[PDB]
């Protein structure tokens, strides 16, 4: 890494000492350039994980996330640079500082070789995000939302810290390699039961799982757009990366204990998508949509079968690029109308023709048509879940049927209808918005040709 | 914890001196300078043996040697001795500065009839090389064995293997 981490860190003094107005220019230049460099890690060898140093290593699961995060960094810059152009230079510089720092932690977290090093930076992502949602938020509930997001993540992470150091004292080193090659049978016992619960709850809260998820509708909606992406597009998957790594030692206790989590995710995903069927805030619509997709990842991890892990990463990457897109979409309207109510701005295809097209493919990707990467992920989990139990196809498909109704629902309510009479401030979409949307959907459809890169560490 | 065996009542019958303090202190210096041979090694026994029971043999000798000194005065200028020690008691401090004239009378008598000279100032307060026959005790405190000290740390320092070894930190 050093070859990505150092350029990422070096963006921090660059943006601070950059020219007065060239901050957005230069930061966008090299963040795209750094993403190009991170494309180098998309290659993985036969079976051994790509190892660079003792503290840093990559595999066929971290690298597809690493490129996603570094590719995201330009996107938050352009999306947020609309409203941020109306404050002090230091304030705008402080934001770009914070996204650069937030991305820096994500790159170092995903390639962490020691589980303790993983946990330190995994929880360290809270500080850049927490200040983003609170300081630069555009509502009043953000103050309560930031507390909800911070406390939920921390309340689960702290048992992990106690559990993690326990492995250090008992088993020895916690390197992701030495853990794998020295896996021992975690026998069923009450102490092992809470050992299992502690090492799992921390990542479950950040998924989020059905019930430990009320921070998401508050955090995501109130957060600024530069944040509203990352809290949905990368760091939810950060909890995912934690699960797929920590479950190396939690066998065979996982199958005996997974039942409450499976039923909560498998049944709650129907309820969560049912919220999306009747919602009032467009941001909340996508937010609860993310919960349903992540809930499908939650069940996917726990069968611990080759197909499930592949469909886990496939949906995990695809949803992040998708859910990031919809937040850009809701941002554009929210700037023009200065409200988030769905029915307020009905009719956009009449006034904005291409915005409807971008909305069409955006709502289509969430609809997960074949061969879109969303479908290639959900379909894999359905087959893996069906092999686990034949009944689950009733629940698994029900969401697939239900997710069609709401995913096309904002398409009908916002785009396909009579334009609202009283609104008169809609402007022709800036070429920044359309260019940003292309930056989201073009890699997604391009990724369809070669799913092997994102298929996970079991291809 | 065991037996506290101590000498019987048989050996505790010495010819105890029947004099009082004034007559004891009236002579004092002459007695100290003429009966030092049984005093020194008995007191040395008291310090070296650290136990009263083991020095009973020397304990009786000093008392016995006192009698030989005491009755030697009786065959001699004991009448000046009586006038002396019967003048010392009258003072509450038993101090010699108020009985100098009788100090002379006792001294002049004992100077020629016996020859016991007056010990000069500081002469009694003197560490002496008393000859003795008993060997020194191997452990006067009867000390038991001593715990073996922990093995000594040694060996040239070597760099800490793989550095700090604390979590993921290296070097
Ligand atoms: C906010 C509430 C909690 C949210 C959910 C958190 C996750 C649920 C589980 C909670 C416990 C997490 C703490 C786990 C510590 C490390 C676990 C581990 O490695 O297993 C040990 C087992 O861990 C424990 O024994 C402790 C965890 C069990 C629960 C009791 C303490 C936690 C609950 C109370 C505090 C947290 C709740 C909030 C209070 C305000 C094994 O050691 P042993 O018991 O075998 O020790 C050797 C020998 O047999 C005797 O020691």
Give dist(CA A2, CA A59) in Å, integer: 16
The rounded distance, in Å, linking the Cα atoms of A99 and B154 is 54
Give residue B155's Cα distance to chain centre: 52
Q: Is B143 on the interface with A (CB under 8 A)?
A: no
A40 SS3 class:
helix
B47 close to A (CB below 8 A): no
Residue A299 in contact with residue A381, Cβ under 8 Å? yes
SS3 B23: helix
Question: Phi-psi category of A210—alpha, beta or left, where left has phi over 0 and alpha has psi -120 to 50?
Answer: beta
| Cα distance between residue A135 and residue A143, in whole Å | 9
Chain B nearest CA to A39, separation (Å): 27
- A338-356 as b/e: b if 16+ CB within 10 A: eebebebbbbbbebbeebb
Distances (CA, A) of A225 to A84, A138, A149: 11, 10, 16
Residue A261: phi, psi to the nearest 5?
-70, -40
Cα gap A179→A171, rounded to integer Å: 9
Min Cα separation B166/chain A (Å)? 10
| Dist CA B100 CA B80 (whole Å) | 13
For residue B159, the distance in angstroms to the closest alpha carbon of chain A comes to: 19
Please name the helix (run of DSSP H) or strand (run of DSSP E) that holds residue A57, with its range, or none: strand A57-58
Structure letter (DSSP) for residue B136: P
B48-86 as b/e: b if 16+ CB within 10 A: bbeeeebbeebbbbbeebbeebbeebeeebeebbebbbe
Residue A56: φ, ψ to 5°: -130, 135
Query: Tokens 């459809």 map to which residue?
Result: A445
Handedness of CA A177, A178, A182, A187 (dihedral sign): negative
Instruction: State the residue for tokens 């992470």.
Output: A157
CA dihedral (A392, A397, A400, A403) positive or negative: negative
The whole-angstrom separation of Cα A98 and Cα A136 is 12
**Cβ atoms < 10 Å from Cβ of A89:** 12
Token pair for A156: 């689960």
Nearest CA to ligand 1 atom 31: A194
Cis upstream peptide for A358 (omega within 30°): no
Name the residue at shortest CA distance from atom 48 of ligand 1.
Answer: A191
Contact status, residue A14 vs residue A26, Cβ threshold 8 Å: yes
The number of CA neighbours under 13 Å toward the Cβ of B14 is: 16
- Which among A141, A320, A165 is positioned nearest to A218, based on CA atoms? A141
8 Å CB contact between A105 and A128: yes
Measured between its terminal Cα atoms, the distance across chain B in Å is 60
Q: Which atom of ligand 1 is nearest to the CA of A155?
A: 1
| Alpha-carbon separation of residue A165 from A172, B27, B44, B166, B167 (angstroms) | 10, 86, 68, 11, 9
Cβ distance A55 to B167 less than 8 Å, yes or no, reads no
The residue to mutate among A171, A174, A191, A257, having the most atoms of ligand 1 within 8 angstroms of its beta carbon, is A191
Cα-to-chain-centroid distance, residue B38: 11
Contact status, residue A177 vs residue A49, Cβ threshold 8 Å? yes
Distant-in-sequence, close-in-space partners of A241: CB < 8 Å, separation ≥ 6: A61, A62, A65, A109, A110
A114–B168 C-beta distance less than 8 A = yes
Q: Which residues of A touch B167 (CB under 8 A)?
A: 114, 116-117, 168
Distance from C-alpha of A70 to C-alpha of A37, rounded to nearest angstrom: 9
In angstroms, how far is CA A372 from the centroid of its own chain? 18
Supply angle C-alpha A117, A119, A124, rounded to 5.
Answer: 100
Resolution (A): 3.9
What is the DSSP track for A251-301?
TTHHHHH-HHHHHHHHHHHHHHHHHHHS-SBHHHHHHHHHHHHHHHHHHHH
Tokens, residue A207: 């998924």
A202 lines ligand 1 (CB under 6 A): no
Yes or no: say if B15 and B67 are a contact pair by the CB < 8 Å rule: yes
Phi, psi for residue A252 in degrees, rounded to 5: -95, 15
With tokens 């955090």, the residue in question is A219
Q: Is the peptide bond before A208 cis (omega within 30 degrees of 0)?
A: yes
Give chain B's length.
Answer: 171
Determine the distance separating the centroid of ligand 1 and the alpha carbon of A157, expressed in angstroms.
Answer: 13
């Amino acid at each position: 890494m050093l070859k990505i981490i150092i350029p990422t860190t070096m963006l921090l003094p660059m943006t601070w000492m950059s020219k007065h107005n060239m901050i957005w220019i230069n930061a966008t230049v090299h963040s795209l350039l750094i993403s190009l460099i991170s494309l180098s890690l998309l290659n993985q060898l036969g079976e051994n994980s790509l190892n660079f140093s003792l503290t840093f290593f990559s595999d066929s699961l971290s690298a597809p996330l690493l490129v996603l995060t570094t590719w995201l960094l330009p996107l938050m810059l352009m999306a947020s640079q609309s409203h941020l152009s109306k404050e002090t230079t230091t304030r705008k510089k402080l934001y770009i500082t914070m996204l650069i720092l937030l991305q820096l932690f994500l790159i170092m977290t995903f390639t962490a070789t020691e589980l303790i090093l993983f946990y330190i930076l995994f929880e360290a992502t809270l500080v850049p995000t927490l200040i983003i949602i609170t300081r630069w938020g555009n509502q009043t509930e953000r103050l309560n939302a930031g507390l909800y997001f911070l406390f939920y993540t921390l309340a689960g992470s702290l048992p992990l810290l106690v559990a993690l150091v326990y492995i250090q004292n008992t088993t020895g080193s916690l390197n992701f390699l030495i853990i794998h090659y020295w896996s021992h049978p975690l026998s069923n016992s009450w102490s092992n039961i809470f050992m299992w619960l502690a090492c799992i709850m921390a990542f479950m809260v950040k998924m989020p799982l059905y019930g430990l998820h009320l921070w998401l509708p508050k955090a995501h909606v109130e957060a600024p757009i530069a944040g509203s992406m990352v809290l949905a597009a990368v760091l939810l998957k950060l909890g995912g990366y934690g699960m797929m790594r920590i479950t190396t030692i939690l066998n065979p206790l996982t199958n005996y204990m997974a039942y409450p989590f499976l039923m909560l995710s498998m049944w709650g995903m129907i309820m969560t998508s049912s919220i999306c069927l009747r919602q009032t805030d467009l941001k909340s619509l996508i937010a609860y949509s993310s919960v349903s997709h992540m809930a499908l990842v939650i069940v996917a991890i726990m069968i611990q079968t080759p197909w499930s892990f592949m469909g886990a990463t496939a949906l995990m990457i695809a949803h992040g690029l998708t859910s990031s897109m919809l937040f850009c979409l809701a941002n554009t309207n929210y700037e023009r109308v200065h409200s988030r109510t769905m029915i307020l701005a009905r009719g956009l295809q009449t006034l904005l023709p291409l915005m409807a097209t971008w909305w069409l493919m955006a709502s289509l990707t969430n609809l997960a048509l074949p061969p879109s990467i969303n479908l290639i992920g959900e379909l894999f989990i359905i087959t893996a879940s069906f092999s686990w139990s034949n009944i689950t196809i009733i629940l698994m498909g029900m969401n697939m049927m239900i997710t069609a109704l709401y995913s096309l629902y904002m398409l009908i309510t916002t785009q396909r209808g009579k334009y609202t009479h009283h609104i008169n401030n809609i402007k022709a979409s800036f070429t920044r918005e359309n260019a940003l949307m292309a930056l989201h959907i073009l890699p997604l459809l391009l990724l369809t040709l070669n799913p092997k890169m994102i298929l996970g560490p079991l291809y | 914890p065991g037996i506290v065996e101590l000498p019987t009542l048989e050996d505790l019958k010495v010819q105890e001196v029947k004099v009082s303090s004034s007559v004891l202190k009236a002579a004092a210096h002459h007695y100290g300078a003429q009966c030092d041979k049984p005093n020194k090694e008995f007191m040395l026994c008291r310090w070296e043996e650290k136990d009263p029971r083991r020095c009973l043999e020397e304990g009786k000798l000093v008392n016995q040697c006192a009698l030989d000194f005491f009755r030697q005065i009786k065959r001699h200028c004991a009448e000046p001795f009586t006038e002396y020690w019967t003048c010392i008691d009258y003072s509450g401090l038993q101090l010699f500065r108020h009985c100098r004239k009788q100090q002379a009378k006792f001294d002049e008598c004992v100077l020629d009839k016996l020859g016991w000279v007056r010990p000069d100032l500081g002469e009694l307060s003197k560490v002496t090389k008393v000859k003795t026959d008993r060997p020194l005790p191997e452990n006067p405190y009867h000390s038991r064995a001593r715990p073996e000290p922990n093995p000594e740390a040694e060996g040239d320092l070597k760099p800490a293997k793989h550095g700090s070894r604390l979590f993921f930190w290296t070097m």
